[PDB]
Design a protein around this ligand. Structure first.
Ligand SMILES: Nc1ncnc2c1ncn2[C@@H]1O[C@H](COP(=O)(O)OP(=O)(O)O)[C@@H](O)[C@H]1O
Ligand SMILES: Nc1ncnc2c1ncn2[C@@H]1O[C@H](COP(=O)(O)OP(=O)(O)O)[C@@H](O)[C@H]1O
Ligand code: BEF
Ligand SMILES: [Mg+2]
Ligand SMILES: [Zn+2]
Ligand SMILES: [Zn+2]
Lengths: 190, 94, 411, 242, 98
C-alpha cells in the first residue's frame, strides 16, 4: 500500500468497512443436513408444491387435502362408475368366462364389501383393519435419519438454464443469470 | 470497481449514480460523476504488450518491477532465455 | 397342468400373461375420463382426438389403489379375455398356476384383499406372491442377456442381489438378502412418473403456453426428447445451442400426435399451421433431479445418499457382494445412461475397495423383469414356492401375509 | 505466422548405413566427403564410447559450416545436450573465461535421472487430539485429517509435522491439499468446489475438485545436466528470517 | 500466474535425494551420520515384508485361483473376502517397500 499514508485510526478494521452516498443513511448490522439448516414452514411449503406436482390435472388438482392428510397422518369419486363398472360386463364381449366358482363364506362376502368399499389409505388410518404400528412401519420404514448431502448443490437458473454471469436479485433472493430474466423476475418472481 | 478475480487488488474508479430521486424535501445535491454504462459483468480479453526484458527480470528475481524501474537487472543467465524460448513457442502454438 | 402364469403387478399398470410366453400383456391399470361427462376404459384414451382437456381418474391413489370394484373388473377385462389376448386364457383358476407378484410393499390388509379376490373370485390353487425383484436374479439360470457395466472408469437364480424398481406412482429400492428382501430398508425416491409429468408441464408453462390442460402433450414430448445427461450438469448446458429442439404442435383435430423438427436434420422442410414451441433451455432440469432432487425443491437428499445408507445398513458379509450385485428394474430405467451415471457418481462416492457391478437391461426394465420371472416360473423353483389349495381356509389368511406372503415376513 | 531465417530448410544429413549420401535431401546438396565425415563422427558420438574428440574444418564464409553444425545437432535429437555459442562470448566480465569454458564443459555432459513419489489429497473430516510423560506441558503427535479426493476417501494420520503443515497451508475443512509424503509438507491445489459458493464473490480460486484416488503415486523422469545442480547448491533455497 | 503451473508436473525432489548437502552441514556431525549409515542397510524393514509376502503367496497359490476376481467379489460367499484380503496385503506390502 501507500506506505505510512494518511490515517487517523478511523475504524480501519480489516473486516469492517461501511460507506455509502447516503440514500438510506445506515450502517452495518451489530448489537451437512437440511433438517439442521432451515426451519419447517418452508419445507412444508415445498412438500405441498411437490404434492401438487403429484396432481396431474383437474382429476387430482383438488385432491391436495387428501394427500396432505395422508402424509401428515365424477373426477375422483372412486373407480365405481356404472359407465365404468356396470358397463364392463359387456366391454369384454370379445370372449370371457365370468362364472361363479366359489362357496358361501365370509371371504366371499369380503369379496363384495371390500369390492366397492369406498375405502382409502386415509380410511385405513381411520379404520382398524390394520393396527397402529403397521402405518408407522409403512411410513418410517422409508425415510432416512441424517444423510442429507454428500455432493454439493447446483443452484440452476430459475427461468433459463445459464451457468455463468449469474446474479441474485436485490430483495427477492432468487437465483438467476441473465439480466433479461430480471425483467420478469422483478414482476413475477420478486 | 474494475475487479479482477486473480488479482486481489480491487480498483475503484471514483463515484457512480443510481436512478432514484431519494427523499421528498429539497436534495439530490452534490452528484455529478461518471455513471456505469456497460453490463454488470462481461469478459474482457485485455491485451498487454511487454518485451523480453520484463519477463527475464521476472524470472531472475521474485520482484521484477524494482529492477525495471531502477535499472539493476543483473546479467540474467542463459537457461532463463532457453525456457522463455520454449514457453513462448508453445504459447504461440496454443 | 404344469405351466404357470405370471402377473407383474404395479402402481400404473400390470404385466399379465402366461409364464410360458415371452411377450408382454400390458394391462394399463389407470382409468380416466374426458371433458364431456362420461368415462373411458383403461386402455382406450390414445385412440381419441380430444387433447384440449385431460382428466385422469386412475384407480391408483398416491401410493396404491385402495378399491377393487372396477380395477378387479379391469383385471378381468385384461386377463379373462382370450380373443384380444389370444392363446393366453385364465378360464376360471381352479387349477391355474398364477403368481400375482403384487407390490408387496402394500399393506398386509391390501395383500389380503388381493389374496381373497384371487382365491375366491378367481378361485386359485397355486400362488407364491413375491415381488419380481425376488425373481430378477434368474438371468444366470438360462441364457440371459445383460450388459456388464462397471463405473470404475469411463437356488438356480443368482444368490445375492440389491434391486431398484422404478415406476410411475413411485420408485423404490430394497436389498434382497439371499433371495429374501430386507424390508426394514424399504427406500423410496419421492419423484415418480406423475411427478415428472407435473415438473415438465410446470417448467414449460414458464417457457410456452399452457400445458396443464394438455398434459398428454408433455407426456409425448417427454417420451420423444428427454434423457439423462451423459456426464454431468454443466458439461451438458455449455452447448445447448446445438441441441435445442422446436416442438411442432399437433393439428389438434386431425393429427394423432405432434412432432419435433431437429436442428441436426434438414430432412423436414414442412412447417405446420399450428405454432411451434421452441424448446431451448429446459431439457437438463429434469434428469438431474433423479440424482440431485434439490432441483425439484424437495427435502429428498438424493439416490446416492439413499444407496449408501442402504449398503451401510448391510454387513460386510454381503455389502461388498451387494454392490457387486446391483440391478435396476422398472420402466424409468429405460431412460438412457441412468445406470452409467449412477455407477460413476457412486464410484466417486465409493472408496477404492468396493468394486462396482451394476446391471440394467437395454430397454424397458419392467418388461425385462417380467420375462425373467416368466423364465423363473418355467423352472420348478416356484413349484416348491407355491401354496397348496388347502392353505387358505382352515387358518386365517392374514397369517399368510404375516409369516409367509407379506412384507412383514421380510422386514 | 512463420519465420524462416537462413534455416528450417535443413532437417538432416541424409545418409544410410553404408555411408551413401543423397544429392538433394535434408536441405543439403553436394559435399559427399563432408557428409560422410559428419555421419561417421555422429555414429561414433551415438555410442557414448569416448570423450574429448576434436576436429577442425577449413571452410570459408557461406560454405556451409553453420548448416552442418545445425544438422549434426539435430542428428542426436533434442534430448542430447548442445551449446554452440559465439567465440566472442568467452571474454566475460564477472568470471574468468577459462572458468567459463570449464562451466560449458560441465553443462555439455548430460544425464537422465528419475524419482518415484506418492502424494495424498478435499478434507472429509477432522479429529485432533501423546503424553508428556514428564515435566513437559503436553505432547501433540497425531491428528486424523480427512482426504476427500474424487475416487474414494481415505483419511489418515501421520507425524505431527504434517499437522503443522496443514496449519501452514491454512486450509479449511472444505479445502483440498496435495501432500507429497516424501517430505510431509503441503502443496496447495487451492480451495474446493463442494464446500464452495459460501459467497457470491471469491478472489481465491474455487479450483477444480481433485480427480482420482487420494493415495496418488507416480514416477518422473527428468534429463538435467550437472551445472544446474551446482548453481542450485550454490544459493540457499529456503529460510524464514532476514 | 501464467508461469507457475508445471511445478508438480515434472518436479524431482532434490532434498529427498540428499543433494542439498551445502545447506545440511548446519546441524550435522560426522560420527552420528556414519553410525546411522552403518545402522541403515535393510535388516529392519524387509523382515515383516517377507512375513506378509509369505501369507500373500500361500493364499495366492491355491486359494488365489479365484480370490481377487470381481465376479468372485460378486457371485460368492467367501471369495469376496479373499479378494479383499489379497488387495489389502498387496497394498500393505508395496507401501512397506516404498
Ligand atoms: N425410456 C424411458 N425413460 C424414462 N422413463 C420411462 C421410460 N420407459 C418407461 N418409463 C417410465 O416407467 C413407468 C412405468 O412404470 P409402472 O410400473 O407402470 O409404474 P407404477 O408401478 O407406478 O404403475 C412409466 O410411468 C414411465 O414414466
Ligand atoms: N550445401 C548446402 N546446401 C543447402 N544450403 C546451404 C549449403 N551450404 C550453405 N547453405 C545455406 O547458406 C546459408 C549461409 O551459410 P553459412 O552459415 O554462411 O555458411 P558458413 O558457415 O560456411 O559461412 C545457410 O543458411 C545455409 O542454409
Ligand atoms: F409402482 Be411404482 F411406481 F414403483
Ligand atoms: Mg418398474
Ligand atoms: Zn434466467
Ligand atoms: Zn427479485
Amino acid at each position: 500500500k501507500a506506505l505510512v499514508e494518511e490515517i487517523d485510526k478511523k475504524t480501519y478494521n480489516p473486516d469492517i468497512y461501511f460507506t455509502s452516498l447516503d440514500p438510506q443513511a445506515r450502517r452495518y448490522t451489530s448489537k451437512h443436513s437440511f433438517e439442521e439448516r432451515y426451519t419447517q414452514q418452508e419445507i412444508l411449503q415445498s412438500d405441498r408444491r411437490f404434492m401438487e406436482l403429484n396432481t396431474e390435472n383437474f382429476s387430482d388438482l383438488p385432491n391436495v387435502p387428501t394427500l396432505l392428510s395422508d402424509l401428515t397422518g365424477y373426477g375422483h369419486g372412486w373407480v365405481l362408475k356404472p359407465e365404468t363398472l356396470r358397463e364392463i360386463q359387456l366391454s369384454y364381449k370379445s370372449t370371457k368366462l365370468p362364472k361363479p366358482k366359489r362357496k358361501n363364506t365370509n371371504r366371499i362376502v369380503a369379496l363384495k364389501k371390500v369390492l366397492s368399499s369406498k375405502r382409502n389409505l386415509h380410511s385405513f388410518l381411520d379404520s382398524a383393519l390394520l393396527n397402529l404400528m403397521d402405518k408407522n412401519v409403512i411410513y418410517h420404514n422409508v425415510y432416512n435419519k441424517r444423510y442429507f448431502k454428500v455432493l454439493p448443490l447446483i443452484t440452476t437458473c430459475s427461468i433459463c438454464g445459464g451457468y455463468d454471469s449469474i446474479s441474485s436479485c436485490v430483495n427477492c433472493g432468487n437465483k438467476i443469470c441473465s439480466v433479461s430474466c430480471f425483467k420478469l423476475h422483478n414482476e413475477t418472481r420478486c | 470497481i474494475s475487479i479482477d478475480k486473480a488479482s486481489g487488488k480491487i480498483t475503484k474508479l471514483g463515484r457512480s449514480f443510481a436512478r432514484s430521486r431519494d427523499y421528498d424535501a429539497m436534495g439530490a445535491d452534490t452528484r455529478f460523476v461518471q455513471c456505469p454504462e456497460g453490463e454488470l459483468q462481461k469478459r474482457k480479453t485485455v491485451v498487454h504488450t511487454v518485451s523480453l526484458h520484463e519477463i527475464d527480470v521476472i524470472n531472475s528475481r521474485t520482484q521484477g518491477f524494482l529492477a525495471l524501474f531502477t535499472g539493476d537487472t543483473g546479467e540474467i543467465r542463459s537457461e532463463v532465455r532457453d525456457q522463455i524460448n520454449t514457453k513462448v513457442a508453445e504459447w504461440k502454438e496454443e | 397342468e404344469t405351466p404357470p402364469i405370471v402377473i407383474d403387478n404395479g402402481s400404473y399398470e400390470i404385466k399379465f400373461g402366461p409364464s410360458t410366453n415371452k411377450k408382454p400383456f400390458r394391462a394399463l391399470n389407470a382409468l380416466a375420463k374426458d371433458k364431456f361427462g362420461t368415462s373411458y376404459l383403461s386402455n382406450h384414451i390414445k385412440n381419441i382426438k380430444d387433447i384440449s382437456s385431460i382428466t385422469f381418474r386412475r384407480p391408483h391413489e398416491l401410493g396404491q389403489l385402495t378399491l377393487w370394484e372396477l380395477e378387479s373388473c379391469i383385471w378381468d377385462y385384461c386377463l379373462f379375455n382370450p380373443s384380444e389376448f389370444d392363446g393366453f386364457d385364465l378360464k376360471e383358476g381352479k387349477g391355474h398356476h398364477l403368481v400375482a407378484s403384487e407390490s408387496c410393499m402394500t399393506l398386509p390388509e391390501l395383500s389380503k384383499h388381493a389374496d381373497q379376490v384371487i382365491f375366491e373370485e378367481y378361485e386359485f390353487d397355486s400362488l407364491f406372491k413375491s415381488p419380481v425383484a425376488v425373481f430378477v436374479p434368474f438371468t444366470k439360470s438360462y441364457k440371459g442377456e445383460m450388459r456388464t457395466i462397471s463405473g470404475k472408469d469411463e437356488s438356480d437364480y443368482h444368490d445375492f442381489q440389491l434391486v431398484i424398481d422404478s415406476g410411475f406412482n413411485c420408485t423404490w429400492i430394497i436389498p434382497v438378502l439371499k433371495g429374501i428382501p430386507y424390508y426394514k430398508a424399504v427406500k423410496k425416491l419421492d419423484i415418480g412418473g406423475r411427478f415428472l409429468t407435473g415438473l415438465l408441464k410446470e417448467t414449460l408453462s414458464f417457457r410456452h403456453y399452457n400445458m396443464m390442460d394438455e398434459t398428454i402433450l408433455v407426456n409425448n414430448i417427454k417420451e420423444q426428447c428427454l434423457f439423462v445427461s451423459p456426464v454431468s450438469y454443466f458439461d451438458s448446458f455449455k452447448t445447448k445451442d446445438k441441441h435445442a429442439l422446436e416442438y411442432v404442435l399437433p393439428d389438434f383435430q386431425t393429427s394423432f400426435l405432434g412432432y419435433v423438427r431437429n436442428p441436426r436434420k434438414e430432412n423436414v422442410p414442412l412447417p405446420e399451421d399450428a405454432q411451434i414451441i421452441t424448446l431451448t433451455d429446459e431439457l437438463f432440469t429434469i434428469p438431474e433431479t433423479f440424482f440431485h432432487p434439490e432441483i425439484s425443491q424437495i427435502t429428498k437428499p438424493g439416490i446416492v445418499e439413499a444407496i449408501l445408507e442402504s449398503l451401510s445398513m448391510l454387513p460386510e458379509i454381503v455389502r461388498p457382494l451387494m454392490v457387486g450385485n446391483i440391478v435396476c428394474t422398472g420402466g424409468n430405467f429405460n431412460l438412457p445412461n441412468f445406470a452409467q451415471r449412477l455407477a460413476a457418481e457412486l464410484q466417486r462416492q465409493l472408496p477404492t475397495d468396493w468394486t462396482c457391478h451394476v446391471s440394467v437391461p437395454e430397454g424397458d426394465c419392467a418388461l425385462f423383469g417380467w420375462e425373467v420371472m416368466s423364465q423363473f416360473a418355467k423352472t420348478d423353483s416356484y413349484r416348491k414356492a407355491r401354496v397348496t389349495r388347502e392353505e387358505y381356509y382352515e387358518h386365517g389368511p392374514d397369517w399368510c401375509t404375516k409369516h409367509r406372503f407379506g412384507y412383514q415376513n421380510w422386514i | 505466422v512463420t519465420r524462416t531465417a537462413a534455416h528450417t530448410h535443413i532437417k538432416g544429413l541424409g545418409l544410410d548405413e553404408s555411408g551413401v549420401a543423397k544429392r538433394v535431401e535434408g536441405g543439403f546438396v553436394g559435399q559427399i566427403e563432408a557428409r560422410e565425415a559428419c555421419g561417421v563422427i555422429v555414429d561414433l558420438i551415438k555410442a557414448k564410447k569416448m570423450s574429448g574428440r576434436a576436429i577442425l574444418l577449413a571452410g570459408g564464409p557461406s560454405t556451409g559450416k553453420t548448416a552442418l553444425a545445425l544438422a549434426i545437432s539435430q542428428e542426436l535429437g533434442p534430448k542430447v545436450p548442445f551449446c554452440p555459442l559465439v567465440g566472442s562470448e568467452l571474454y566475460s566480465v564477472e568470471v574468468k573465461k577459462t572458468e567459463t569454458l570449464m562451466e560449458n564443459f560441465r553443462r555439455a555432459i548430460g544425464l537422465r535421472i528419475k524419482e518415484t513419489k506418492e502424494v495424498y489429497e478435499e478434507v472429509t473430516e477432522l479429529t485432533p487430539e501423546e503424553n508428556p510423560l514428564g515435566g513437559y506441558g503436553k505432547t501433540i503427535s497425531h491428528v486424523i485429517v480427512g482426504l476427500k479426493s474424487a475416487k474414494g476417501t481415505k483419511t489418515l494420520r501421520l507425524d505431527p509435522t504434517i499437522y503443522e503443515s496443514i496449519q501452514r497451508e491454512k486450509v479449511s475443512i472444505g479445502d483440498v491439499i496435495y501432500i507429497e509424503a516424501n517430505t510431509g509438507a503441503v502443496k496447495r491445489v487451492g480451495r474446493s468446489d463442494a464446500y464452495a459458493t459460501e459467497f457470491d464473490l471469491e478472489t481465491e480460486e474455487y479450483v477444480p475438485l481433485p480427480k482420482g484416488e487420494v493415495h496418488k503415486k507416480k514416477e518422473i523422469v527428468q534429463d538435467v545436466t550437472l551445472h544446474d545442480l551446482d548453481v542450485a547448491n550454490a544459493r540457499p533455497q529456503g529460510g524464514q528470517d532476514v | 500466474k501464467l508461469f507457475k503451473k508445471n511445478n508438480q508436473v515434472n518436479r524431482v525432489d532434490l532434498d529427498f535425494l540428499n543433494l542439498v548437502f551445502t545447506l545440511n552441514d548446519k546441524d550435522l556431525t560426522s560420527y552420528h551420520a556414519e553410525e546411522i549409515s552403518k545402522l541403515t542397510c535393510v535388516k529392519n524393514f524387509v523382515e515383516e515384508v517377507n512375513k506378509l509376502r509369505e501369507t500373500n503367496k500361500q493364499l495366492q497359490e491355491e486359494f488365489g485361483e479365484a480370490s481377487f476376481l470381481n465376479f468372485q467379489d460378486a457371485n460368492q460367499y467367501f471369495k469376496y473376502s479373499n479378494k479383499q484380503k489379497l488387495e489389502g496385503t498387496v497394498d500393505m506390502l508395496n507401501f512397506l517397500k516404498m
